[PDB]
C-alpha cells in the first residue's frame, strides 16, 4: 500500500474489484483491495472511485482499472499473488500516464 | 492547509500571540476570527477557557468548532483553588466529591471527542478522576461535613504551604 502511495495514483479514472468471498483462491485479490483502499492511495486523488463487487456465484476473481491514457488494465487474479498484482499495477499504470 | 488547536478564555480574543504567530502564519485573518469567536463565546458568562478546533483551509478562509472547556479549569473551580500542585501527589491542592466529578462529566459528554464515543458517564468520570490525579486534586466518597471541617483545615495548610513556598522562592530567587 505504500509503494502505491509513493507513485501518485492521480492518473487513474476508476478502480473496481470483482471477487467471490467463498472461494479458496481469493485472498490475493482481497490483499489488493485493502492495498488500494488505504488512506494514502485513496487521498492521492479524489477523482478516482473504488468499487468492490461482491458475488457468490461469479467464481472468477478479477481486477479492472481504467486510466486517462484511454487505457484499460484487467488482471484476473486466480493464481496470481498479491505483490505480483501490485508490481504489475505499479509498472503498468505509472510508466503509462 | 491544516488544523489548529487553540485553548482560549471566554470573553478574551486578541490580535497577538498565540493567535498572531499561529493563525497569522497560516495566512488567515485574525480579526474575522476574533469577531466570530467572540460572538459565540460572549454567550458563556461562566468565564471558561475552551479548547477549540480551527480548520484552516487552502484558500486562507477558515471554519471553527468550539468544544467544552478544559478539565483543568473545571477542577480548579471544583476544588476552588487557583493553581494546581507544584509536586503532585506528594502534596494536596484541593478537594472534591462524587458530585463535582459527575457534573463536570455530564458537562463534557457533549465534547467533540466524547460525543462520537458512546461511552457511559462512568467512563467519563474515570477520565476526569485520572485528570484530577495529576492536577493534585483529591476525590472523596462522602465528604460534606468533613468537606468544610477540611476546607477550614486544608485551606489553612495550603496557605501555610503556599506562603512557605513563596518565602522559600524569595530566598531561592535571592540566592540565585
Amino acid at each position: 500500500a505504500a509503494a502505491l502511495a509513493r507513485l501518485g495514483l492521480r492518473a487513474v479514472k476508476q478502480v473496481r474489484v470483482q471477487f467471490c468471498p467463498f472461494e479458496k483462491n481469493v485472498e490475493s485479490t482481497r490483499t489488493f483491495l485493502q492495498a488500494v483502499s488505504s488512506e494514502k492511495v485513496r487521498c492521492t486523488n479524489l477523482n478516482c472511485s473504488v468499487i468492490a463487487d461482491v458475488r457468490h456465484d461469479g467464481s472468477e476473481p478479477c481486477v479492472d482499472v481504467l486510466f486517462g491514457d484511454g487505457h484499460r488494465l484487467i488482471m484476473r487474479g486466480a493464481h496470481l499473488t498479491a505483490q505480483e498484482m501490485l508490481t504489475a499495477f505499479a509498472s503498468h499504470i505509472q510508466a503509462r500516464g | 492547509s491544516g488544523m489548529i488547536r487553540a485553548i482560549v478564555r471566554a470573553g478574551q480574543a486578541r490580535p497577538g500571540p498565540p493567535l498572531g504567530p499561529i493563525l497569522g502564519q497560516r495566512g488567515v485573518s485574525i480579526n474575522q476570527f476574533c469577531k466570530e469567536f467572540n460572538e459565540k463565546t460572549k454567550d458563556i458568562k461562566e468565564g471558561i477557557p475552551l479548547p477549540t478546533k480551527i480548520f484552516v483551509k487552502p484558500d486562507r478562509t477558515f471554519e471553527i468548532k468550539i468544544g467544552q472547556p478544559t478539565v483543568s479549569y473545571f477542577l480548579k473551580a471544583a476544588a476552588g483553588i487557583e493553581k494546581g500542585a507544584r509536586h503532585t501527589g506528594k502534596e494536596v491542592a484541593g478537594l472534591v466529591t462524587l458530585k463535582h466529578v459527575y457534573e463536570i462529566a455530564r458537562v463534557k459528554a457533549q465534547d467533540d471527542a466524547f460525543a462520537l464515543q458512546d461511552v457511559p458517564l462512568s467512563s467519563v468520570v474515570r477520565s476526569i478522576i485520572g485528570s484530577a490525579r495529576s492536577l493534585g486534586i483529591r476525590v472523596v466518597k462522602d465528604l460534606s461535613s468533613e468537606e468544610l471541617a477540611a476546607f477550614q483545615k486544608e485551606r489553612a495548610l495550603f496557605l501555610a504551604a503556599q506562603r512557605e513556598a513563596d518565602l522559600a522562592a524569595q530566598a531561592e530567587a535571592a540566592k540565585k
Partner: protein, 162 residues
C-alpha cells in the same frame, strides 16, 4: 510451476495466472524418517559442486537459488547447496540456466577462462602482488569451507588453500 502471462489487445491488457505440471518427489526414499530433502536421500556430506543433476533441482530457470522455505532444506545444507551452485555457475556448468538476451550473445569477449572450484567472484579479487615468504605466506582459497565435511575417501583432509 505457475506461469504468469501478459497480453496486449486494443488498449486493454490482460494478466493471468496459469498452472503447469510439477514433477514429484521420486517414490521411494532411503531414509523416509529423514527430515530434510538432502538427508532422506542419504546425500549428506556426499554431493559436491560437481554434481549438477542434484543442484539443478533447486534454482530458478534464470539461474538463481530457490528460497529455503519452499525447498525445505536444513539450513546448513541450504548454505552448502548455495555455495555449490555459485561454484558450478562459475565453473561453466549449467549453461542453459543463464538469462536469455538476444543482443549480448553477439559481442564476443576473450574466450572464457576455464576455471573450477572458485570461492569468490572473479571481478572482486585483487591480484596478490606480494606473495610473501615461507613464514608469512599469502594463500589462495580453493573451494569453500562449507564443504570441508564431505567424506574423504583418501583420508587426507581436502586442501582449501593454495
Amino acid at each position: 510451476f505457475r506461469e504468469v502471462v501478459e497480453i496486449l489487445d486494443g488498449k486493454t491488457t490482460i494478466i493471468e495466472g496459469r498452472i503447469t505440471e510439477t514433477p514429484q518427489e521420486s517414490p521411494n526414499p532411503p531414509n523416509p524418517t529423514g527430515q530434510c530433502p538432502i538427508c532422506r536421500w542419504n546425500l549428506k556430506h556426499k554431493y559436491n559442486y560437481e554434481d549438477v543433476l542434484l543442484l539443478s533441482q533447486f534454482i530458478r530457470p534464470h539461474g538463481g537459488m530457490l528460497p529455503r522455505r519452499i525447498t525445505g532444506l536444513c539450513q546448513e545444507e541450504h548454505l552448502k547447496i548455495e555455495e555449490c551452485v555459485k561454484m558450478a555457475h562459475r565453473a561453466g556448468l549449467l549453461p542453459n540456466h543463464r538469462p536469455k538476451l538476444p543482443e549480448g550473445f553477439v559481442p564476443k569477449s576473450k574466450p572464457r577462462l576455464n576455471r573450477y572450484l572458485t570461492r569468490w567472484s572473479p571481478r572482486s579479487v585483487k591480484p596478490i602482488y606480494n606473495k610473501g615468504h615461507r613464514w608469512n605466506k599469502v594463500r589462495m582459497p580453493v573451494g569453500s569451507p562449507l564443504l570441508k565435511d564431505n567424506v574423504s575417501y583418501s583420508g587426507r583432509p581436502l586442501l582449501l588453500y593454495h
